[PDB]
Design a protein around this ligand. Sequence first.
Ligand SMILES: *[C@@](C)(CO)[C@](*)(O)[C@H](Cc1ccccc1)NC(=O)[C@H](Cc1ccc(OC)cc1)NC(=O)[C@H](C)NC(=O)CN1CCOCC1
Ligand SMILES: [Mg+2]
Ligand SMILES: [Mg+2]
Lengths: 195, 231, 235, 240, 244, 233, 212, 222
Amino acid sequence: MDIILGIRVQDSVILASSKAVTRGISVLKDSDDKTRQLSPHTLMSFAGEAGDTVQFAEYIQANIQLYSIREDYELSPQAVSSFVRQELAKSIRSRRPYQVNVLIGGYDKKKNKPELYQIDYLGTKVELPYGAHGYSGFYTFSLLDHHYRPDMTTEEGLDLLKLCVQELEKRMPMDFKGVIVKIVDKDGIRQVDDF
Amino acid sequence: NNYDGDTVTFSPTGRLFQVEYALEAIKQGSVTVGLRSNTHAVLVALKRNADELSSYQKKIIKCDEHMGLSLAGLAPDARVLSNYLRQQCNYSSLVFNRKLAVERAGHLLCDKAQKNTQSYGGRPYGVGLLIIGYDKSGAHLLEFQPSGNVTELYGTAIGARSQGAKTYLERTLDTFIKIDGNPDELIKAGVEAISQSLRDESLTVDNLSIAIVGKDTPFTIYDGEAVAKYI
Amino acid sequence: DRGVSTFSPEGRLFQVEYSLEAIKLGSTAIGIATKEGVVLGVEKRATSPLLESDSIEKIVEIDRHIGCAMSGLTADARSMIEHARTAAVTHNLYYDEDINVESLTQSVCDLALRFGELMSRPFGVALLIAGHDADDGYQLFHAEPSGTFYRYNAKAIGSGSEGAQAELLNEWHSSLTLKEAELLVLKILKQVMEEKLDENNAQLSCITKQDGFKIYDNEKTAELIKELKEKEAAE
Amino acid sequence: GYDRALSIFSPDGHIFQVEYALEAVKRGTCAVGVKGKNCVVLGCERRSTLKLQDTRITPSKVSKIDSHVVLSFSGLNADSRILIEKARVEAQSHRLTLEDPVTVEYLTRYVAGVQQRYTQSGGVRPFGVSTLIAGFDPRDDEPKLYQTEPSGIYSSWSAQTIGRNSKTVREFLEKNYDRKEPPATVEECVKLTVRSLLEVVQTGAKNIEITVVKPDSDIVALSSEEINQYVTQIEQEKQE
Amino acid sequence: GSRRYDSRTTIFSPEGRLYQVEYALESISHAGTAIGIMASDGIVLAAERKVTSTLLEQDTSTEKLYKLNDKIAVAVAGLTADAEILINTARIHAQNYLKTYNEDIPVEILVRRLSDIKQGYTQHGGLRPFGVSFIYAGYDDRYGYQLYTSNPSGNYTGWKAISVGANTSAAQTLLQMDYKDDMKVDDAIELALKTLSKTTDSSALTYDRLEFATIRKGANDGEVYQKIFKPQEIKDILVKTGIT
Amino acid sequence: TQQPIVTGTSVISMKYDNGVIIAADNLGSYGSLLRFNGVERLIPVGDNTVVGISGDISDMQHIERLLKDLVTENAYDNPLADAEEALEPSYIFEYLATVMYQRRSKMNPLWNAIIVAGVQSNGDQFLRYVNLLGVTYSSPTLATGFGAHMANPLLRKVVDRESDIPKTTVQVAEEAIVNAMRVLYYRDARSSRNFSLAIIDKNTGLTFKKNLQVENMKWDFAKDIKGYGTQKI
Amino acid sequence: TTTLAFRFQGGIIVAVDSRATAGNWVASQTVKKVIEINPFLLGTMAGGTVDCQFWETWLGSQCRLHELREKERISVAAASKILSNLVYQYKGAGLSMGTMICGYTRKEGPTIYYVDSDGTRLKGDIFCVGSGQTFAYGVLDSNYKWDLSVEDALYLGKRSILAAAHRDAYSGGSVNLYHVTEDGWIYHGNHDVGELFWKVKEEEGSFNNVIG
Amino acid sequence: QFNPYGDNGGTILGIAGEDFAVLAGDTRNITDYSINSRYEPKVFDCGDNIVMSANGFAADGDALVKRFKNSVKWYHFDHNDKKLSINSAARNIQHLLYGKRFFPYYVHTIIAGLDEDGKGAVYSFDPVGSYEREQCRAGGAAASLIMPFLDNQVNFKNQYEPGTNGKVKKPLKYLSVEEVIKLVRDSFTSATERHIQVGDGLEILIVTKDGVRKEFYELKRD
Ligand SMILES: *[C@@](C)(CO)[C@](*)(O)[C@H](Cc1ccccc1)NC(=O)[C@H](Cc1ccc(OC)cc1)NC(=O)[C@H](C)NC(=O)CN1CCOCC1
Ligand SMILES: [Mg+2]
Ligand SMILES: [Mg+2]
């Protein structure tokens, strides 16, 4: 885990998530996908404590998929984010809390708008034009403050994202082995293979 | 009639019909005999089969190195009660380093059977047991009835046609009680006792079941070719 | 009404006796034990021709060394099988060995009387449990809802049981080969079955020390049916 | 807790509560399942004593358990919801632990197990419901059709019907369905299903529902006009 | 023991019917008639109070029509006390959904859960079922205006127009006669009152023996308003349609 | 989790040819304060067992009640309660040992060291130790606390192994015990002069001696000792 | 410990050492760190001995129950997830495990899953687990190609354990080799480091740091 | 704060032959610098030709042996008097030990007996249940002293054939019961010399197809 970013543009939400899985002084894997598709137009990236992350992501995934089958209907990104926040808000006062931070990128088909939600392990939800968890924010936020515009295209968003990854690769202490980038829009979720 | 729907109901003459019907299951069961001397205690049991293709239902169960019983009636109920005895014998060993007295074993079975005759929902045990054992006060023989009534005896028999063996032992009392330091003769007396309850059938090699416990003899069961000696 | 765990005046549990009537309505199942193995066979009895008969699963594996056939309310057997499988695997976990066929049967029979006012009624299904272990060799057990089990050299349960059992009484001897037993199950099944016996409405299985428990293919059973018809015509 | 043993044996060896639950199924609207060479079709009767219905919102007779499996039923409607919900939850639980969607046999086995549990549990009555469960196993193109019933028994069927007048439509299917050659196409399978319901239904208007399931989570429900075309075509060939 | 006195509320008849559910429905058939009619631009809920006394306080009274949330209402037919138990559950269930998803509960989801509770009382627990039939009238952004009904069996169905309680057979025939799909709310108001006026067991239908409610999008722009009619407002609408 | 408040010090014991001897002083210490002087720390069970207890006194009194209750319970439905089915030392020990280990396993121990001395029904000497940890052991001589460090060395000079037991009389054995009690009074800061002694013999039975005193003490040499080194006066 | 398993053209190689330690005390030199769950399934052990030993044989019981219930051998993914979901329930309690669930099935092909006691579960081609994992990685990575022959792949797995066994103080004893194919796993012997080191040194010309 | 564990010292040793197996252990029991007993046996015959010892904290050791002895008893009741094989006993003990994984039995457990082919068998356990069959194992306080000596004399480790240039190893062979007992006695006398918690006496339990025999030898009492 470590680096997860998110950028909402005019017509889509773009999530970038690091590929490295490190444990001790060894990088065990350099191709890890730190994300789960909750519904056809909703994607959740995650970072935090080992084990907790995937366990939480898949637990949410199962619940949203259960809802979809029961109602034959897709929950809005806002509705999914509120469900996720409540689960983390319960968790924080449990015997052993989920130590997982998430970004939820979704395309609301009723509003025809992209939506990006940042939720930390405490259950602190915020809707944002761009988001990051962990130390990534300490570089990317100031960079995006400068270069981000609300009316950008998906291609402009990817170039803006390349700028963030380049900055992180230059100044971050750890090698996070690049990122897997995914785009969420009106046509659903797809992965950029060459980044 | 109207007072046999459950065990919690008394009849107008003060009878518990469910307990009496449980007692009836014992009478249908195959005959088993118990007797003892001052040194050894012996169980003899007539086993019963479903047909010629089936095995013969085992009647005797070991409870500890120094104790065990024979059954007549519902076999699963004997398994429940024998398992309880195994635990109680075992509790006495682990906690107090003490072999459970055969008399206490009876008291425990009595109290377990009784609780099933005073509460709604439950049912009486449908089996009669003959417990033999050798403890610090010598050899013992007990007769358990699912009414709760436990009785210490020199000899006895329960099951179908048990009255024949019970009459024989009542005549033979003075003889077999003094068979001390002789296992084979005490068994012979028990095998002759159970023979008074036979009709049309005789004791064969896979039909007879004998058990013995005594002064220098752990509770052991004899079946198959090991009982051929006594036919 | 009346209590579920009530005794009759003859000293029998009403519900257990009534469950035995349900088993008599069930489809026929036959088991034969030899020194070369134990054979289990059942009547499938499809209620309609549109029903795909291969989905009728009345012979079942418990472990590699223990198999099981059923008769009566076959839905009731699912939890009995589940318990048997868990009991078998659990014993292997605790003791690093195969569990005795008798101990397995006893474990299944402990469920039987756990009913009253635990489950609400006895099981309405009888089981034929066949297996092998190193101590007592090839064994066949008949497990009832009374909590009682008998070891058998051969046994039939179900609607054609009393007619088949009388036939097994004459045919069984202590020197039967496995092949002889296979044919004997087919022969006796064909006698008591309503519809004409073939590979689709009857199923065979066996347990051997070497190859363990195996349900036969419809192709393999079909050849044994053809071999059986030829041998009866040959004298 | 309420403990009463409601499902119990009778002197003749019958569990009357389970058998009376079958009567509830016999009262329910007819449901039919027919599987072709590359598909399964679930047909369902809808009684026409109810006009002024709102068909947009009224619970559909065929329910998706997962994206690849469907469940139709006959009997008590309220009871069916409890089975469907449990089945849907188990479907997601299976994906979570096995990392693979349920097989149709597994899902059927689960639902049948639930039904059985309610026949020997204290304080409960059996489900007054029989189900037809149809679909395709993951990465498999062989059609699957299973039937369950209140007792808990389940089995696979080339074609089957349940509910009221099911014995009439089963009679039809038994002579019209060839095991050697099942309906080769979707059109053939739907037509045979509609034909079989027309033996019992009344009018082929808003009385028949048809749901087609194809491999790889390809499930679609036919509209009124689409079904009405089959009804119109069948009647014209009949007048001969 | 206590087996002797057990009615066995959750068992089947030999015909495969649930005795208690059938008898609960028989109970409901004596309750005051309630009618729901769904129009393209709103929904009408009309209900007849059970034989009123002149000294009954009419304005501060609630017997038939209850509010579940801002978008959903119910008309009751049966035991009022039973209905209130279920209504408070439904009110809580709506708030749980809003708390969880930050969105008003879809009508069907609320109806299903309430109907699932009723179903439970027919299958387990050994208790009597709720002697209540609901007409649910509500709006959400998925299906728009919706009418449902649930009954003691826990079975629910959707409707364009429906009646529960007394004389449903006669009422349903009349609704089936005059109902059409392009209908407006004001027309539906008139149909609801006309139907009660003909099916009523009373001599004449008056304001004091009625409860009335509408669910329109007649607020200001793309939002739904619930109107539980006051006594004087029922008096006026009864004159406006020429019943009194 | 506990801490002991009112405490009892050493319990000492040994086997001799026909039975066992056990002894313990009558003091109930409250830290450094020698609070209670009438405390009996030897508790007879029947006429064939004595349980000697050191450590926490509140827990000792609890154990007293358990043993007292054990005698009552054994007598129930037991015609041979004063004969063949009387409580043996081995039964009493195993019961306590079970309790001690169960309590330590629940992290709530009875803060005691216990020595069960007695004679079995077949005449065999019984002497076994158990403590708060549930640790059990047997030896010809057993002692707790300071007794383990000072008494055992003296008692082992009399009975050093099994073969020395038949060669040891009750006179010799009691003399060693009484000597050990004196040494403990010299050197244990939480001991008292007053003590109790119990003899369980296979022939003469249980002899319980109360209000014994340590005597024949050597203190006279103290007058010659002056200062701590160089002081001459 | 040092354990590895890697995927390649000809299936899966699995190699482990055989040392057990209690601090600096060498407890054993002959420990089995591979458990044969079934003919198509292997599990490697690193961390607390019992935690691995106990729960992986328990895993084998769960896999047996799956094929009894489902009439089909369990997938490597499902098998690994039973173990990972189990240890996740004990997360924080202090279980110590670094395991690798290796096996072949029809639907998956050759598959390796890393599962540890803090709940991490990862699919991957190459993993090294244990105190000497870094030493094994060094040799394995620098010599790994997908197109290795079965003969060369077996040696590389053996040589990588030897590398770690030599440098890591808490690794050694002997090398246990396994090869997993479409037909199942095949055992390729126990190789004592006592003889293997000198044999490799002489024949390969490596280990020049060591006094020959 | 109350400490539920203690250290009762002592040491144990199990060796397996071709048709026999020995399980030895000193009879000294200690706490801190005091001797509790010079003869307190901790090697026990558990029935079915299985000898067992759980060395370390004696309270836990006795508790475990007591539970396993009881486990054997119930194995007979539940499985028609079937003999509990040494491999089955080993697995059963793992579950006993792991049952208290989070509040362990503070003991190094060793069992010995014969396998189902009649060959000598020794199994050894850590405190929480990990087990392994071996030819040789020392356990307890002086395990670190004795074990390397056993590697050298039982398994012939570091011993090469004279004149073969350190190329041919000394071949493995089974030892006679006479030779094994010599090694046991020398192991314990050496351990007694250099470890303070070891001494007083040595009790060896030998297991053959004929049963369980005992031998006792004096050790230094200082
Ligand atoms: C190498 C040798 C580095 O330790 C391996 O990780 C090895 C893995 C292994 C797997 C299966 C079979 C044998 C060996 N690990 C060990 O040998 C292990 C090291 C270890 C000790 C304690 C730990 O707890 C944090 C974790 C790892 N050694 C043991 O497990 C030894 C045999 N047992 C003990 O130390 C007993 N302890 C274990 C923990 O609980 C208290 C008792
Ligand atoms: Mg090394
Ligand atoms: Mg010394």
